[PDB]
Scaffold this active site. Structure first.
Site, PDB file in Angstrom:
ATOM      1  N   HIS B  41       0.791  -1.242   0.000  1.00  0.00           N
ATOM      2  CA  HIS B  41       0.000   0.000   0.000  1.00  0.00           C
ATOM      3  C   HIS B  41       0.829   1.303   0.000  1.00  0.00           C
ATOM      4  O   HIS B  41       0.341   2.364  -0.329  1.00  0.00           O
ATOM      5  CB  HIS B  41      -1.078   0.070   1.132  1.00  0.00           C
ATOM      6  CG  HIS B  41      -0.562   0.513   2.475  1.00  0.00           C
ATOM      7  ND1 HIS B  41      -0.306  -0.394   3.480  1.00  0.00           N
ATOM      8  CD2 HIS B  41      -0.319   1.740   2.995  1.00  0.00           C
ATOM      9  CE1 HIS B  41       0.073   0.260   4.567  1.00  0.00           C
ATOM     10  NE2 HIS B  41       0.074   1.558   4.294  1.00  0.00           N
ATOM     11  N   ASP B  90      -0.823  -7.302   1.488  1.00  0.00           N
ATOM     12  CA  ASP B  90      -0.197  -5.987   1.637  1.00  0.00           C
ATOM     13  C   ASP B  90       1.337  -6.185   1.848  1.00  0.00           C
ATOM     14  O   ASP B  90       1.876  -6.064   2.954  1.00  0.00           O
ATOM     15  CB  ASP B  90      -0.857  -5.179   2.754  1.00  0.00           C
ATOM     16  CG  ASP B  90      -0.427  -3.687   2.764  1.00  0.00           C
ATOM     17  OD1 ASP B  90       0.225  -3.248   1.805  1.00  0.00           O
ATOM     18  OD2 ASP B  90      -0.767  -2.968   3.724  1.00  0.00           O
ATOM     19  N   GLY B 190       2.518   6.052   9.270  1.00  0.00           N
ATOM     20  CA  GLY B 190       3.872   6.304   8.840  1.00  0.00           C
ATOM     21  C   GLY B 190       4.845   5.165   9.182  1.00  0.00           C
ATOM     22  O   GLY B 190       5.935   5.181   8.664  1.00  0.00           O
TER      23      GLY B 190
END
Ligand SMILES: *[C@@H]1O[C@H](CO)[C@@H](O)[C@H](O)[C@H]1O
Ligand SMILES: *[C@@H]1O[C@@H](C)[C@@H](O)[C@@H](O)[C@@H]1O
Ligand SMILES: [Ca+2]
Ligand SMILES: [Ca+2]
Ligand SMILES: [Ca+2]
Ligand SMILES: [Ca+2]
Ligand SMILES: [Ca+2]
Ligand SMILES: [Ca+2]
Ligand SMILES: [Cl-]
Ligand SMILES: [Cl-]
Ligand SMILES: [Mg+2]
Ligand SMILES: [Mg+2]
Ligand SMILES: [Mg+2]
Ligand code: NA
Lengths: 142, 254, 198
Positions: B41, B90, B190
């Site tokens: 992602h 992912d 993050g």
């Protein structure tokens, strides 16, 4: 507990119940009281659950009410000491004691292996780096 | 990372900072001198594919020191099955253009065999997660690398302990939950792509990738990390492949 | 597969067995145990039993709190189906064993009654510890006794394994003893010992 010449004396717990098996009413006539009689009978009529020798592999049995407890030698476990610890050397059991990788070998002993950068020691399970900076170690500590 | 600690310099020596056009993008994990694992992602919005850099040996984003090593990213390999904007599959495998040099501050994390990871590493209760992500949900990112110890849940427990959320993503076989439901400690946006690393009998291994969550450290929710054990064969095959001309490769999965 | 259910801890003097349902039909079980913060240890690998002895894991720390879970795997062989146990803290919840009166002795106008040391599954240096070794001052023994020619009952309590009680001379008395952890509110007492009389 009947043999007619032996029935001539007043009640005796030693005679009636410990040298002979007595019925609940015989014991009641001796103790008289309901709770005293109940307390005695609950154990006396319970039986020794260790009589069938349920503890395997040299374990020791202790009797309880309608039950027992087995105390195992160090190499055994289980309710009846039936499980051999020595026969559980397999990969799903704490990784077969291997430091890194573990391979099951049915019929025979499991083997241990290492990730790239390491080699298997003589001890058959422990791994040592073969390079300066093997993966997965933090050198600033060591 | 919410509710973590600063990772002492050099103590997370497999952590990767990924940059695009020189700006912080995501974390990643070095697994040997050429290959980095991160989250698919992270790449959903990339237009400049030839401007991705991996930084190893990073600690404090505000000061350079002589332990940092930067390498251009030559290839980003994502499962074909992954759908941009969604959560399943992912993972991304990144080839660096030149190898890093291993040093006391730059070391790869071990990628484990599948069976060892499923049967043994999956039952080590705590593992470490790290990155320079947000220090609070919707907050500012960290300047020093942060690290957090999180316990893992089997998915049945994670479903039973998670607050119901309408139309939320499925937790699939390709994921696992770890962390704490009480709002105190979690990975955050993050930190995506960074390692969930598991210590077992003296060696650290890669077990998860920071992937998704409901906010960060939300009460009634755990973090979700890509279950790297399901990809071992896919990664090992791809690390043996020849490079291709464009940066992005969508490779079949399984 | 079907998930285990009715998971139950059966534990006496630290011998601790987890039990569950149902009897397996084309499935087998493996159990895992952990403390809240520790790793999961597997036991009873691919068993067809509906029980698993966990004594050896729990005796390592009887004051810890353990959780177990039983996995079901289909015969021939995602995460498996499983069910979690209640939590179990052995020091707080293990049953106290039925005790045995070891001896009684007339000394003075008094009788000493001695309770046999109750042996537990906790090991120290090749020996099984007694209940008093494990529990110390949290354990007492209680004595229910009566004079046969009297109505009603007397009780004495001891911090050791012995009772010294006053008796009327030339009379028979019967006795029975229980182990008790008075600080508990549930499962506070053993069953009564067999009755022994003079
Ligand atoms: C007699 O022995 C059997 C097993 O061999 C056991 O089931 C009983 O409980 C014991 O008393
Ligand atoms: C009872 O306890 C077990 C452990 C063994 O030591 C036996 O020999 C003993 O009778
Ligand atoms: Ca007779
Ligand atoms: Ca008789
Ligand atoms: Ca009679
Ligand atoms: Ca009669
Ligand atoms: Ca009995
Ligand atoms: Ca820096
Ligand atoms: Cl480069
Ligand atoms: Cl004792
Ligand atoms: Mg006699
Ligand atoms: Mg009679
Ligand atoms: Mg009568
Ligand atoms: Na939370």
């Amino acid at each position: 507990a009947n043999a007619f010449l032996e029935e001539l004396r007043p009640g005796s717990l030693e005679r009636e119940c410990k040298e002979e098996q007595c019925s609940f009413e015989e014991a009641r006539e001796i103790f008289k009281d309901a709770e005293r009689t109940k307390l005695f009978w609950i154990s006396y009529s319970d039986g020794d659950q260790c009589a069938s020798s349920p503890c395997q592999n040299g374990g020791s049995c202790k009797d309880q009410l309608q039950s027992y407890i087995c105390f195992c030698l160090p190499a055994f476990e289980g309710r009846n000491c039936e499980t051999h610890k020595d026969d559980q050397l397999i990969c799903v059991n704490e990784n077969g004691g291997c430091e890194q990788y573990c391979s099951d070998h049915t019929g025979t002993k499991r083997s241990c292996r290492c990730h790239e950068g390491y080699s298997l020691l003589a001890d058959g399970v422990s791994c040592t780096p073969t390079v300066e900076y093997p993966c997965g170690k933090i050198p600033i500590l060591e | 990372i919410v509710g973590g600690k600063v990772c002492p310099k050099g103590e997370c020596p497999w952590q990767v900072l990924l940059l695009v056009n020189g700006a912080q993008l995501c974390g990643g994990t070095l697994i040997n001198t050429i290959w980095v694992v991160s989250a698919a992602h992270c790449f959903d919005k990339i237009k400049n594919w030839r401007n991705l850099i991996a930084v190893l040996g990073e600690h404090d984003l505000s000061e350079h020191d002589g332990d940092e090593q930067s390498r251009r990213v030559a290839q980003v390999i994502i499962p074909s099955t992954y759908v941009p904007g969604t959560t399943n599959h992912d993972i991304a495998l990144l080839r660096l253009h030149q190898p890093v040099v291993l040093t006391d501050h730059v070391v790869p994390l071990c990628l484990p065999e599948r069976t060892f990871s499923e049967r043994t590493l999956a039952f080590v209760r705590f593992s470490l997660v790290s990155g320079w992500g947000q220090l609070l949900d919707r907050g500012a990112t960290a300047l020093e690398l942060m690290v957090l110890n999180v316990p893992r849940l089997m998915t049945q427990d994670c479903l039973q302990q998670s607050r119901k959320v309408g139309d939320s993503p499925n937790i699939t076989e390709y994921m696992f939950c770890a962390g704490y439901s009480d709002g105190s400690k979690d990975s955050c946006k993050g930190d995506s792509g960074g390692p969930h690393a598991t210590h077992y009998r003296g060696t650290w291994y890669l077990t998860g990738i920071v992937s998704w969550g409901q906010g960060c450290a939300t009460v009634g929710h755990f973090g979700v990390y890509t279950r790297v054990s399901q990809y071992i064969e896919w990664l090992q095959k791809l690390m043996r492949s020849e490079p291709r001309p464009g940066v992005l490769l969508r490779a079949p999965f399984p | 597969t079907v998930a285990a259910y009715n998971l139950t801890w059966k534990s006496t003097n630290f011998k601790t067995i987890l039990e569950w349902e149902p009897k397996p039909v084309n499935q087998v079980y493996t159990v895992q145990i952990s403390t809240k913060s520790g790793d999961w240890k597997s036991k009873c690998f691919y068993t067809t039993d509906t029980e698993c002895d966990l004594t050896d894991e729990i005796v390592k720390d009887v004051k810890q709190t353990y959780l177990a879970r039983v996995f079901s795997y289909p015969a021939g062989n995602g995460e498996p189906l499983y069910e979690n146990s209640p939590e179990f803290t052995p020091y707080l919840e293990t049953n106290l064993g039925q005790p045995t009166i070891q001896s009684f002795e007339q000394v003075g106008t008094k009788v000493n009654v001695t309770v046999e040391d109750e042996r537990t599954l906790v090991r120290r240096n090749n020996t099984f510890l007694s209940l008093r070794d494990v529990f110390g001052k949290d354990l007492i023994y209680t004595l229910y006794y009566w004079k046969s020619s009297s109505s009603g009952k007397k009780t004495a309590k001891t911090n050791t394994n012995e009772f010294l009680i006053d008796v009327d001379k030339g009379e028979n008395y019967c006795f029975s003893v229980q182990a008790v952890i008075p600080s508990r509110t549930v499962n506070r007492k053993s069953t009564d010992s067999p009755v022994e009389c003079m």
